[PDB]
Amino acid sequence: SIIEEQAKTFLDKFNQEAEDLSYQSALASWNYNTNITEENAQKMNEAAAKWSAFYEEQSKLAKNYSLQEVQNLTIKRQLQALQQSGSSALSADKNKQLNTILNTMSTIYSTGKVCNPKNPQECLLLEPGLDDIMATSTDYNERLWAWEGWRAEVGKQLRPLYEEYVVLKNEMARANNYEDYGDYWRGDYEAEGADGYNYNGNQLIEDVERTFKEIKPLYEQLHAYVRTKLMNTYPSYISPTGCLPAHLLGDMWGRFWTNLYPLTVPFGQKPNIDVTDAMVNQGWNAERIFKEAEKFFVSVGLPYMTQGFWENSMLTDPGDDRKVVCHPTAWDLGKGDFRIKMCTKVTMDNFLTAHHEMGHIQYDMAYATQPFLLRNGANEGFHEAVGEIMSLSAATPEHLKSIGLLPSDFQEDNETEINFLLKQALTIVGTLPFTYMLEKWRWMVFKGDIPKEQWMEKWWEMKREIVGVVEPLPHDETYCDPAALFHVSNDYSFIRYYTRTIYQFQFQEALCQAAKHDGPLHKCDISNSTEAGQKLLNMLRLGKSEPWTLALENVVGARNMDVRPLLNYFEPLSVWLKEQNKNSFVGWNTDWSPYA
Amino acid sequence: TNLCPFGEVFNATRFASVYAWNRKRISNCVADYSVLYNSASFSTFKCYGVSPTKLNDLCFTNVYADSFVIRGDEVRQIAPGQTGKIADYNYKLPDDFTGCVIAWNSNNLDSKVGGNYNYRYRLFRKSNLKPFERDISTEIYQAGSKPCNGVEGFNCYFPLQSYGFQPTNGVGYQPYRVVVLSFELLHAPATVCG
Numbered sequence: 001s002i003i004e005e006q007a008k009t010f011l012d013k014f015n016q017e018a019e020d021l022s023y024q025s026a027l028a029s030w031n032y033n034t035n036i037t038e039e040n041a042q043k044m045n046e047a048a049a050k051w052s053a054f055y056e057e058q059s060k061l062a063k064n065y066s067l068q069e070v071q072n073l074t075i076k077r078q079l080q081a082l083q084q085s086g087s088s089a090l091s092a093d094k095n096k097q098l099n100t101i102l103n104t105m106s107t108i109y110s111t112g113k114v115c116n117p118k119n120p121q122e123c124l125l126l127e128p129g130l131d132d133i134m135a136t137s138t139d140y141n142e143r144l145w146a147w148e149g150w151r152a153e154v155g156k157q158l159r160p161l162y163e164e165y166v167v168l169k170n171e172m173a174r175a176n177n178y179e180d181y182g183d184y185w186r187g188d189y190e191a192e193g194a195d196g197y198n199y200n201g202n203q204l205i206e207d208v209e210r211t212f213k214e215i216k217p218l219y220e221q222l223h224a225y226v227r228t229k230l231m232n233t234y235p236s237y238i239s240p241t242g243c244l245p246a247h248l249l250g251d252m253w254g255r256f257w258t259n260l261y262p263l264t265v266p267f268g269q270k271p272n273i274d275v276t277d278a279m280v281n282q283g284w285n286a287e288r289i290f291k292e293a294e295k296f297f298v299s300v301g302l303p304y305m306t307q308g309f310w311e312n313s314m315l316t317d318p319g320d321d322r323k324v325v326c327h328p329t330a331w332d333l334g335k336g337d338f339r340i341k342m343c344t345k346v347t348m349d350n351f352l353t354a355h356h357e358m359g360h361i362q363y364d365m366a367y368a369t370q371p372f373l374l375r376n377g378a379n380e381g382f383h384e385a386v387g388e389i390m391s392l393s394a395a396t397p398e399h400l401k402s403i404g405l406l407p408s409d410f411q412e413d414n415e416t417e418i419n420f421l422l423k424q425a426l427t428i429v430g431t432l433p434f435t436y437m438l439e440k441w442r443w444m445v446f447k448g449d450i451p452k453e454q455w456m457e458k459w460w461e462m463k464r465e466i467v468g469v470v471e472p473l474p475h476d477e478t479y480c481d482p483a484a485l486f487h488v489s490n491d492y493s494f495i496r497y498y499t500r501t502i503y504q505f506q507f508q509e510a511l512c513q514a515a516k517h518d519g520p521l522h523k524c525d526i527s528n529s530t531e532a533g534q535k536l537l538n539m540l541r542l543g544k545s546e547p548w549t550l551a552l553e554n555v556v557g558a559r560n561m562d563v564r565p566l567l568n569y570f571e572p573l574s575v576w577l578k579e580q581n582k583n584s585f586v587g588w589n590t591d592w593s594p595y596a
Numbered sequence: 597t598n599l600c601p602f603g604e605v606f607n608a609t610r611f612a613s614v615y616a617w618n619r620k621r622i623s624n625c626v627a628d629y630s631v632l633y634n635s636a637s638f639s640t641f642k643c644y645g646v647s648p649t650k651l652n653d654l655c656f657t658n659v660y661a662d663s664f665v666i667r668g669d670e671v672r673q674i675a676p677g678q679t680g681k682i683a684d685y686n687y688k689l690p691d692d693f694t695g696c697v698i699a700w701n702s703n704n705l706d707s708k709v710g711g712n713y714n715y716r717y718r719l720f721r722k723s724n725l726k727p728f729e730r731d732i733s734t735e736i737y738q739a740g741s742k743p744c745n746g747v748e749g750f751n752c753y754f755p756l757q758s759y760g761f762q763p764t765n766g767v768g769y770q771p772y773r774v775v776v777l778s779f780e781l782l783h784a785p786a787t788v789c790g
């Protein structure tokens with residue numbers, strides 16, 4: 001118990017310095033992200049360099065403590081968080097090589113351009129370009145060439161870079177008691193504590209498989225219905241028993257199916273609920289939306305908003321000689337400072353992204369009492385999971401007519417629910433197989449089970465075996481299809497969007513059960529419910545102080561992930577889809593390709 | 597007749613640090629406290645032992661005034677039977693206290709853009725404070741078995757840390773000014789009343 005005292009008296013000084021340094025860095029960043037100029041960028045760089053150097057030096061200094069003689073778990077987690085900094089634990093030349101490889105990969109991805117094969121002088125980019133042509137166009141050959149050109153001009157350049165990047169990342173990973181750049185990523189899903197509460201990185205690879213195996217049939221039903229509906233547009237290319245081509249899924253990669261709604265409306269003879277004219281004619285400004293969100297949040301027992309929030313937050317575009325970065329975000333400046341940056345228009349999607357950001361801000365406000373190296377989420381998916389349930393809650397017609405946006409005599413019909421459920425499904429359940437595939441492929445490439453020869457042949461068979469998507473043209477071992485994605489070529493993990501989707505419906509079901517709500521789960525509103533807010537606040541009061549198993553149990557009472565709430569949310573849609581698919585084939589075969 | 601110099605304590609331009617808080621004696625000085633009570637300027641006026649309403653009849657020999665500046669979330673530590681960083685190494689009150697404290701915000705007169713690092717507070721010390729004691733020492737704190745040699749390094753720290761007051765921080769981080777009044781009934785004749 002002699003190292004205990006030394007660690008305790010060192011963490012205090014570390015916290016005292018880190019608070020000020022982080023506040024300076026965050027303030028510089030916020031100042032740049034509103035009044036963009038060259039001096040502001042210089043100030044950002046000079047503020048961030050000092051914080052990075054201080055953090056690295058403090059980690060190196062603390063690397064003379066040992067986790068085995070520390071029995072208090074409160075400071076053991078802090079020491080583990082501070083010591084785990086194995087990004088510079090490599091030779092300088094190798095580090096410079098790695099950085100230049102990331103830089104050149106990013107430049108190739110951003111600068112990449114493809115040209116019209118019939119009009120040479122028109123060449124397009126991704127953001128003002130190919131993305132729009134996939135979102136809107138319908139012609140088969142147009143989508144085909146736009147897909148193939150991007151695949152052939154990104155992969156050809158990013159193949160050897162990725163090939164020689166894998167070995168460098170494995171070398172970096174096998175210096176922190178890790179076997180590859182796999183387990184290193186999975187190490188966030190780590191917990192320690194009482195009996196039955198531990199969670200290592202090898203259980204995630206089984207929990208994910210179990211959850212996907214339970215999920216699959218609903219995706220099969222949705223895929224069969226989409227395949228049956230997608231024959232009045234291309235009645236010469238779709239096989240009733242086969243799969244779906246990759247260049248017809250409303251997106252460049254197939255990440256989201258939300259762009260297939262106009263071609264797959266269940267009942268197209270009635271518009272969906274879009275309350276925008278109601279706010280336009282009632283005289284609503286940017287501040288009223290945030291006041292309504294504040295009222296909704298205080299209704300459930302959560303605290304008010306800080307006075308400085310209403311003065312230091314840019315809730316609308318200045319509309320002058322001040323160009324800004326217009327992207328919604330929530331900031332935690334530190335030292336009790338909370339701000340929200342977002343361009344606000346009088347429209348419904350802004351009305352929802354305001355609730356999302358205020359949920360983030362409340363979650364940040366909750367754990368301000370914890371030590372410095374404990375103020376974060378719990379499983380890298382809790383933030384957006386907490387922030388996205390408010391969007392679901394504040395979109396029910398009952399909530400809309402309870403605030404003065406719908407007539408009091410509005411009677412909700414039944415045909416609209418099928419449309420809304422299908423629209424939600426095309427975004428929620430139509431992306432899980434893609435995420436599971438991408439993450440498993442990356443893991444098994446990093447481990448070494450895929451050699452260089454099977455690098456691009458396993459991918460284009462796992463896709464048809466899991467997702468149900470086949471390529472329109474054959475691809476040899478000179479392409480790099482996964483590299484043509486932002487999250488793959490920019491070192492971003494790809495399990496958050498699966499884990500968040502799993503937790504969201506568990507949280508929603510627990511909160512709705514606490515509120516004593518009868519009826520379907522998709523018409524639930526947690527307003528005027530103090531017990532639900534109390535349970536949520538009891539959850540979001542710890543941060544990283546306790547293992548995330550306790551955080552999950554504080555709300556749902558479960559020790560691990562569960563998918564039954566997700567299926568319960570989509571019961572009427574499943575019944576309707578089963579009723580519609582009486583004279584159609586449900587599954588698919590993997591021995592069909594539109595080039596043989 | 598004489599008034600009493602409470603305007604040189606509450607209305608002073610410069611206050612002292614927590615580890616070097618000033619102390620002032622009240623002489624044979626006719627004082628009034630209801631004027632202090634009926635002023636909507638203090639965020640904390642709670643009195644232990646005596647009641648503020650019937651505080652113009654009691655007579656005392658000497659009255660002590662102590663002043664310093666602390667953070668917003670540290671006023672609760674200026675109270676008998678309290679434990680924390682402030683009331684263990686900087687300023688500690690006894691359990692038989694018979695006076696009371698005054699606190700109010702000082703953000704506008706104490707915060708500057710970029711940081712005001714003129715206020716410092718003790719962070720490391722061996723023993724407790726032995727209430728109503730001050731210590732002004734810059735000796736290097738020794739944590740490990742290896743002795744320090746007047747230089748900062750491993751397990752050797754400087755036991756002084758400065759505040760980071762800024763005009764944008766939250767209420768729990770805005771600076772607060774604290775004035776503590778203590779009354780003693782000595783064996784000398786009660787010299788002044790209200």
Ligand SMILES: *[C@@H]1O[C@H](CO)[C@@H](O[C@@H]2O[C@H](CO)[C@@H](O)[C@H](O)[C@H]2NC(C)=O)[C@H](O)[C@H]1NC(C)=O
Nearest residue numbers: 295299398399400401402403525526527528529
């Ligand atoms: C939550 O409760 C509040 C009051 O506790 C409701 O506000 C009132 O709602 C009634 C409708 O029954 C109106 O006639 C009042 O004018 C409202 N008063 C105020 C001050 O808003 C609120 O409607 C409830 N919300 C939900 C979703 O049930």
Ligand SMILES: *[C@@H]1O[C@H](CO)[C@@H](O[C@@H]2O[C@H](CO)[C@@H](O)[C@H](O)[C@H]2NC(C)=O)[C@H](O)[C@H]1NC(C)=O
Nearest residue numbers: 601602603604605606607608631632635636637
């Ligand atoms: C410190 O000095 C100020 C004057 O600058 C005093 O302000 C008093 O303010 C109230 C209302 O704000 C007035 O009604 C008084 O007349 C003011 N006093 C004087 C003497 O002008 C303030 O009271 C002083 N502080 C103390 C503790 O006496």
Ligand SMILES: *[C@@H]1O[C@H](CO)[C@@H](O)[C@H](O)[C@H]1NC(C)=O
Nearest residue numbers: 034035036037038039040322
């Ligand atoms: C933006 O920065 C410039 C200098 O970089 C400064 O002159 C100007 O006042 C700033 N504008 C605002 C609104 O802060």
Ligand SMILES: *[C@@H]1O[C@H](CO)[C@@H](O)[C@H](O)[C@H]1NC(C)=O
Nearest residue numbers: 059060061062063064065750
């Ligand atoms: C531990 O301390 C020694 C000197 O006491 C220092 O040389 C060494 O670098 C420290 N450990 C690490 C990992 O830096």
